Design an enzyme around this catalytic site. Structure first.
Site, short mmCIF file in Angstrom:
data_model
loop_
_atom_site.label_atom_id
_atom_site.label_comp_id
_atom_site.label_asym_id
_atom_site.label_seq_id
_atom_site.Cartn_x
_atom_site.Cartn_y
_atom_site.Cartn_z
N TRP A 102 -0.84 3.54 5.02
CA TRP A 102 -1.50 2.43 4.16
C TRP A 102 -0.73 1.18 4.09
O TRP A 102 -1.16 0.18 4.39
CB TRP A 102 -2.02 2.72 2.90
CG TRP A 102 -3.41 3.67 3.02
CD1 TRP A 102 -3.49 4.74 2.37
CD2 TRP A 102 -4.45 3.03 3.51
NE1 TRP A 102 -4.79 5.36 2.85
CE2 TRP A 102 -5.34 4.48 3.46
CE3 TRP A 102 -5.23 2.07 4.26
CZ2 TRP A 102 -6.69 4.37 3.91
CZ3 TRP A 102 -6.37 2.09 4.93
CH2 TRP A 102 -7.26 3.23 4.53
N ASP A 172 -0.55 -2.39 -3.70
CA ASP A 172 -1.94 -1.97 -3.28
C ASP A 172 -1.74 -0.59 -4.29
O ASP A 172 -1.21 0.59 -3.91
CB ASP A 172 -1.80 -1.20 -1.92
CG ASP A 172 -3.46 -0.69 -1.40
OD1 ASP A 172 -4.04 -0.24 -2.30
OD2 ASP A 172 -3.48 -0.36 -0.27
N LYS A 196 -11.52 5.64 -5.19
CA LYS A 196 -10.53 6.47 -5.50
C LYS A 196 -10.19 7.00 -6.80
O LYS A 196 -10.32 8.53 -7.04
CB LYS A 196 -9.18 6.12 -4.94
CG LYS A 196 -8.77 6.28 -3.59
CD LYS A 196 -9.69 5.97 -2.32
CE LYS A 196 -8.97 6.30 -1.02
NZ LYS A 196 -8.18 5.50 -0.46
C1 LIG Z 1 -8.27 4.16 -0.13
C2 LIG Z 1 -7.20 3.19 -0.14
C3 LIG Z 1 -7.16 2.03 0.96
C4 LIG Z 1 -8.65 1.56 1.90
O1 LIG Z 1 -9.69 1.55 0.64
P1 LIG Z 1 -11.12 1.28 1.58
O2 LIG Z 1 -11.99 0.75 0.36
O3 LIG Z 1 -11.46 2.36 2.44
O4 LIG Z 1 -10.98 -0.19 2.35
C5 LIG Z 1 -6.13 1.11 1.08
N1 LIG Z 1 -5.16 1.45 0.77
C6 LIG Z 1 -4.70 2.59 -0.20
C7 LIG Z 1 -3.53 2.76 -0.68
C8 LIG Z 1 -5.81 3.53 -0.38
O5 LIG Z 1 -5.82 4.44 -0.99
#
Ligand SMILES: *Cc1c(COP(=O)(O)O)cnc(C)c1O
Ligand SMILES: *Cc1c(COP(=O)(O)O)cnc(C)c1O
Lengths: 361, 361
Positions: A102, A172, A196
């Site tokens: 990521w 993030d 998530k």
């Molecule tokens: C799930 C996730 C993403 C992507 O999220 P989306 O809503 O699919 O764009 C980005 N970074 C991390 C660390 C994630 O766990």
């Protein structure tokens, strides 16, 4: 039963009680004669839940001041581009901490917008060891330092964050936001796709320090400027109404769990149970990261062979387990144990793992 | 009762039966042991509903070929920027048909991206009269011709669309998509925020002709390129899972109503009842658009004075009516009667309007 052992990595598990409360008022919300999704986003009823969600979030964080909670569409992915688009100016460099898949996707978008720089990297150890805070090299012309707090795919998570000084720290937190308390004052901008750990997919929560987004680049499209959301309380255009409503329900629940400090010790129990299962397996189960970089949100492990891992997945599904299949690119197995994943689902996983081991030995 | 007379303009009314079916399986979907919102977007269960939604949409349109149904976040507003970003090249001009407030907002974003041109305008008559298809002046270097099929705020709607030849016709159908049958072959790209006439807010439906988006501009961020959605079946990142699920439920319902031709004659009955009320009021109620430009989705009307209109709104709310308050910028009153707004809510509105008239005369 009739409630599967859900270890999905995202979308993921939501609290059973929040699903039931939501189901109860799905057709008729508070005797208004309509669903929360048939009401105007500028009306008194929705605006109340809209603003209460923002208030509950900050309260859970210990009430920091000078930060705004924004609700934006597009997922954490759109933020990969929106961040450098709003903060990367000419003469500056977007500094990134490389810790996995990521972090790597965040950096990729950044290059499309401007100059980038890898401040630290754990790629030399296959992302098994997180870079130490000391190893992080920041530039004098850095626009910000971006990091991935929890690497959902590889299973690594930062225990602490660095002091970046005048340089905004951006993180993030898609997979670990509100799973443990942290000092928001250390960050300039924190973001997370809600699917998530906060519930529903379709909304991205952005907590931004007000002084960083007072004025956005005029050249940018209206929907990609942070001040459009700030100046309009995320109501410039129709917001993800139902998703924000569900985010507020999950927040009430986290509070019932004893706030961030409560869900933390609970998530800490679920993680040590599964890691204990791995560490006391005499090599049958192997952890994919160095013990000190271990995540409490995503537990990645492997078996002696690829066929053995294939047998694990199949057997677990036939017995009610969902989502243990490790991510395609990394392989292996992954137990995602977010806030809403019960201690019982973990208890059941530990038993399955013990039985499977003995039936293969 | 306990079901208000909802005339909200967006978010809006959803069919009662679709809300109930959705409520029934909200916690446990098809005995899988989890909600549709706790499942992986790459799993067999969600991918099935995801693809079925696309199949039902095209089928309702008479099964046109060569078009892809995409599900994108950001609302119809984000499409205001994404369209010129993907189709406006240097040397070309973005041609727009100006018919009201939404046409005007679409054009505004376009200028941030490139050269624009007003192909026709109804601004001289205060947007009361739609421009005739003949009046539409297209340029030789036009990248596309963009139009707003239904002007939600002013209450004007196109009865027919022009033949643009080699030049792609693009249309904002947020407020009237799937309310009446049309020839999709005339368009290159059609788009609509789902919250107006397809249900839930948080998803934007884009029906694009495949040959126009085979290759998107490489300089654009990944999430703003149409080919990211095409090549990935709108699954590159986590999609608005629940919203797409709800869109599919509304589609099943439209089919139960006799398809597009069925909902059309039904919506045509609801509109003529309300317009009849306005035309036979001897001037008490006045229509805001020329009869030939009248919309069947959004009915705008005014009273003799501003105070009278204030009295109308108040009295209607005390009697269970929601959303009749005309848009801030235009003033007056607006009865939004989308697909899911019952003929009975319209019957009730016509009676209220008749009683209110007599109590003020
Ligand atoms: C799930 C996730 C993403 C992507 O999220 P989306 O809503 O699919 O764009 C980005 N970074 C991390 C660390 C994630 O766990
Ligand atoms: C509702 C509407 C929009 C804006 O939709 P959002 O999802 O709020 O961005 C744009 N155009 C028309 C014609 C609309 O009716």
């Amino acid at each position: 039963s009739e409630r599967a052992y859900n270890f999905n990595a995202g979308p993921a598990a939501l609290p059973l009680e929040v699903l039931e409360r939501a189901q109860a008022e799905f057709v008729d919300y508070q005797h208004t004669g309509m669903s929360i999704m048939e009401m105007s986003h500028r009306g008194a009823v929705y605006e109340a839940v809209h603003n209460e969600a923002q208030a509950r979030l900050l309260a859970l964080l210990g009430n920091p001041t000078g930060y705004k909670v924004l609700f934006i569409q597009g997922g954490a992915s759109t933020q990969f581009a929106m961040i450098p688009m709003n903060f990367l100016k000419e003469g500056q460099t977007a500094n990134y901490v490389m810790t996995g898949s990521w972090a790597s996707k965040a950096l990729k978008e950044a290059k499309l917008i401007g100059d980038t720089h890898v401040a630290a990297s754990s790629e030399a150890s296959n992302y098994m060891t997180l870079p130490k805070l000391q190893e992080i090299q920041l530039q004098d012309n850095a626009a910000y330092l971006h990091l991935t707090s929890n690497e959902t795919i590889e299973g690594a998570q930062f225990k602490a964050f660095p002091d970046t000084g005048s340089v905004p720290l951006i993180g993030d937190m898609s997979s670990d936001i509100l799973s443990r308390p942290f000092d928001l004052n250390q960050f300039g901008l924190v973001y997370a796709g809600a699917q998530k750990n906060l519930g529903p997919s379709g909304v991205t929560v952005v907590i931004v320090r007000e002084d960083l987004v007072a004025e956005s680049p005029k050249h940018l499209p209206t929907m990609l400027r942070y001040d459009t959301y700030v100046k309009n309380n995320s109501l410039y255009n129709t917001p993800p109404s139902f998703g924000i409503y569900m985010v507020n329900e999950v927040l009430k629940w986290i509070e019932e769990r004893g706030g961030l400090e409560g869900v933390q010790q609970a998530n800490r129990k679920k993680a040590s149970l599964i890691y204990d299962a791995i560490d006391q397996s005499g090599g049958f189960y192997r952890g994919c990261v160095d013990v000190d970089s271990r995540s409490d949100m995503n537990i990645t492990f492997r078996l002696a062979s690829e066929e053995l891992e294939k047998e694990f997945v199949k057997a677990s599904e036939q017995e009610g387990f969902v989502g243990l299949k490790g991510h395609r690119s990394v392989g292996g197995l992954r137990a995602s144990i977010y806030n809403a994943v019960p201690y019982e689902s973990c208890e059941a996983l530990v038993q399955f793992m013990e039985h499977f081991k003995r039936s293969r030995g």
